A paper describes a structure:
Unexpectedly, cross-linking of the 147 and 167 bp nucleosomes with either glutaraldehyde or formaldehyde resulted only in cryo-EM structures of unwrapped nucleosomes, which is in contrast to non-cross-linked samples that show both closed and open conformations. Furthermore, the cross-linked nucleosomes exhibit DNA that is flexible starting at SHLs ±5, indicating greater flexibility in the upstream DNA end in cross-linked nucleosomes. We did not detect closed, open I, or open II states in either the 147 bp or 167 bp cross-linked nucleosomes, which suggests that cross-linking affects the inherent dynamics of 5S rDNA nucleosomes. Moreover, the increased flexibility in the upstream DNA end in the cross-linked relative to the non-cross-linked nucleosomes correlates with a configuration of the side chain of H2A R77 that would collide with a fully wrapped DNA turn. In addition, the two H2A R77 residues in the glutaraldehyde cross-linked 167 bp nucleosome adopt different conformations that are consistent with the highly flexible DNA ends. These findings support a relationship between the conformation of H2A R77 and the flexibility of the nearby nucleosomal outer gyre. Importantly, glutaraldehyde causes only a minor increase in the histone Cα root-mean-square deviation (RMSD) values, suggesting that octamer interactions not involving lysines, such as those of histones H2A and H2B with the HMGN motif, are largely unaffected by the cross-linking.
pmcThe specific interaction of proteins with the nucleosome is central to the regulation of chromatin function and dynamics. The tardigrade damage suppressor (Dsup) and vertebrate high-mobility group N (HMGN) proteins bind specifically to nucleosomes via a conserved motif whose structure has not been experimentally determined. Here we used cryo-EM to show that both proteins bind to the nucleosome acidic patch via analogous arginine anchors with one molecule bound to each face of the nucleosome. In addition, to study nucleosome structure in the context of active chromatin, we analyzed nucleosomes that were reconstituted with a promoter-containing DNA sequence from a Xenopus borealis somatic 5S rDNA gene.
Author numbering:
A (entry chain H): 36 to 123
B (entry chain G): 18 to 108
C (entry chain A), E (entry chain E): 44 to 133
D (entry chain B), F (entry chain F): 24 to 102
G (entry chain D): 36 to 124
H (entry chain C): 16 to 106
DNA sequence: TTCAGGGTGGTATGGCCGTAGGCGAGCACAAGGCTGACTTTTCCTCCCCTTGTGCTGCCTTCTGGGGGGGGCCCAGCTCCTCCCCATGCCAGGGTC
DNA sequence: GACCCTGGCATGGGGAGGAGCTGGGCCCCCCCCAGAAGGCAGCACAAGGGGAGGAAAAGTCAGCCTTGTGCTCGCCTACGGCCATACCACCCTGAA
């Protein structure tokens, strides 16, 4: 489901390093796990606030609630850099 | 996702969010934000596991190396604490 | 002593499967016949049940080793297994 | 009695992977009893999923869901 | 001799709060001031925190008692607390 | 420094409710840290909820959700 | 809030017994927790089987997943009886 | 209405409304509220019959949270079902 | 080859300003029930010794798992029907 | 008392069904060799007993500070109203 996309990132941080076809079966179950977690949390934040829109804010608060200390600090910085580049 | 300097499918995560029944409406910043977060976690994982595989005199990432990075990184260990990585062993 | 330490090292450095596949499959089928007669299994379903059960047992034995070390011991015992299971929740 | 196929050497190998240095004599029976409450639960969850889906073949995805709903995720045997 | 047993009975037949509310509230506000300045609270948020913390410590102490009985002891210790916490996951 | 607010008699009462018959002299200093980390986790989650709700007053529902996020459902403070 | 119906059920089973406000609040959180449990499970099943309608079958399977042993058996029998009587009325 | 027609005492209509607005599926059947209401009624009746006996054991009419905690932690199935639930002021 | 993307109408969501009241911070004041310090003892934890019993290291047999080779037929997937279940929307009134 | 639950009506769409079609799960067969199993010698480590010392339990007493009550003030937050634009549904295109 995401096999292509991991290779793209792989070729950046490890240009010479390949990956097994059993390891990519994990990352396809890893992105499927984190995505469902964040989107399962950003969907409960909206229900608390009696809302119906999963905007960029409901994702960020879901990221901080799930990701540990320093994982949640650069994720909400790299992620924040994405929305200010795609919008403008 | 070239509009936001990413390598992930912003369109695909937007579609999954829309059909996931996660809300009546989905914003136009949630796809980009979640794609960037997914990309950061992916890059962190395949940097730690890449370094691990280099330290094992191998040029290919394998599940043993993936669980050698998740378990040897305390942030990723806490995050994936109830995860059974297939063909991983223990160390 | 040295033999046990070398076995610990070898099986901690290795990632293979520790239970034999065909007897595991017979066990799985024996248990599943009670839930549904004349049931069938994809081979990957059994290959996933195995990689779940073996890691579960490895974790349980790690906790049991901690319990045995608590009582100033190196031998792991049924009482240690039950203590680890009670503290875990099962 | 196909639980006896979970033999003493396999249990010793699992213990040695865990880090155990010495093993008692009843650990084998106790571990067999422990394994047949794990199987008897995950297989029951997977079989009820299969029966809901009107199928008669358990699937890797059925096993993965039966494992994730009891707080034990599996990475690799899906999709 | 019997004081410990009578105290166990007295505090296991009652459901009152065993941590003084004013110091608990001060501790909660000191902890919250490390996150957000001038953050208010409620008369039910602090009570929910008190009930949760007391139930968690009571469970932790029951498991610590189990760890102490394991090591042929009746005196709980930081070793027993650490073993209980490591086994249940924290 | 308001961590001494969890005094020795309170920790002793919490232990004696847990069946504890004798308590070491270093249990109190360790239980203080245990309570501190538990409170810090739950309060950080509740403060995150409150900041999301663009509020300045934490609520019992904030605390209940912050507790549900780690497996400890609370019965009574939501009705 | 399910206070009225919990009160009615309590006076149905125990004719002379009463209940306090705190116990009522506890039961009105118990019900709102179990409802969300059996609804999240019936949503998981509907998404898994790629269907689009929560029905009696999804609730049945969710009950069998959630409630253990005799609780699930008795609850599933009760629900079957309820929906069987529902169509005649 | 549906509540009386299904031989119940719970709000079939309210359960259906909560199911529809709960975003549990794009569509909701016409038997799921009747099934859910009956399951919840049975669970509540079981708990209120056990807590009633527990309270009458102490010769007390009004049911307090301690009675509910005693019933839940005494009956095995309810104990494992609510095995991660803090019955506030229960003991 | 179906999925990501450009342009457009519409509207339902959500943002801005008001505001008014509930309730949360905050200051006094005992007071008495609880915490803090001291003393005693006694009872428990830790160290040592011995042992005898159970666990382990090593041999050897044979047995049963693993690696193919092949069949087949049974069940899971696919495509088209269509018709019946569920929904969108307005109005009256029963209940919470 | 008010608001949403049901009744009623019109309606798109989803899933129950009927075939077909083929992938793979089950069954059988053969072999064979590495691992399981039964045994024995040996040892070293778990458990029982004993002694001591020190560190919590238990009682006493003085003090202190939580808290139960009172009252004040002002700030937060829920509700209202209005309106602005963001997102969705739809039609087409072209691309990975």
């Amino acid at each position: 489901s995401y096999s292509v996309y991991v290779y793209k990132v792989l070729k950046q941080v490890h240009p010479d390093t390949g990956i097994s076809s059993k390891a990519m079966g994990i990352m396809n179950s890893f992105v499927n796990d984190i995505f469902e977690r964040i989107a399962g949390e950003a969907s409960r934040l909206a229900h608390y606030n009696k809302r119906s829109t999963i905007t960029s804010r409901e994702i960020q608060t879901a990221v901080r609630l799930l990701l540990p200390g320093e994982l949640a600090k650069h994720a909400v910085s790299e992620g924040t850099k994405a929305v200010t580049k795609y919008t403008s | 996702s070239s509009r936001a300097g990413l390598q992930f499918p912003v369109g695909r995560v937007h579609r999954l969010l829309r059909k996931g029944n996660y809300a009546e409406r989905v914003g136009a910043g949630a796809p980009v934000y979640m794609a960037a977060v997914l990309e950061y976690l992916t890059a962190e994982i395949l940097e730690l596991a890449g370094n691990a595989a280099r330290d094992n005199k191998k040029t290919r990432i394998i599940p043993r190396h993936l669980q050698l990075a998740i378990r040897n990184d305390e942030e990723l260990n806490k995050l994936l604490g109830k995860v059974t990585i297939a063909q991983g062993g223990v160390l | 002593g040295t033999v046990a330490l070398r076995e610990i090292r070898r099986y901690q450095k290795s990632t293979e499967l520790l239970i034999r596949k065909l007897p595991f499959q017979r066990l799985v089928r024996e248990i599943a016949q009670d839930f549904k007669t004349d049931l069938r299994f994809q081979s990957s379903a059994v290959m996933a049940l195995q990689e779940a059960s073996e890691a579960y047992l490895v974790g349980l034995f790690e906790d049991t080793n901690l319990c045995a070390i608590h009582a100033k011991r190196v031998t792991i015992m049924p009482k240690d297994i039950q203590l680890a299971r009670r503290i875990r929740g099962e | 009695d196909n639980i006896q196929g979970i033999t003493k050497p396999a249990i010793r190998r699992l213990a040695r992977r865990g880090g155990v240095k010495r093993i008692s004599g009843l650990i084998y029976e106790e571990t067999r009893g422990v394994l047949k409450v794990f199987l008897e639960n995950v297989i029951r969850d997977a079989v009820t999923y299969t029966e809901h889906a009107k199928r008669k073949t358990v699937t890797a995805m059925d096993v993965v869901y039966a494992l994730k709903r009891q707080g034990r995720t599996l990475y690799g045997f899906g999709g």
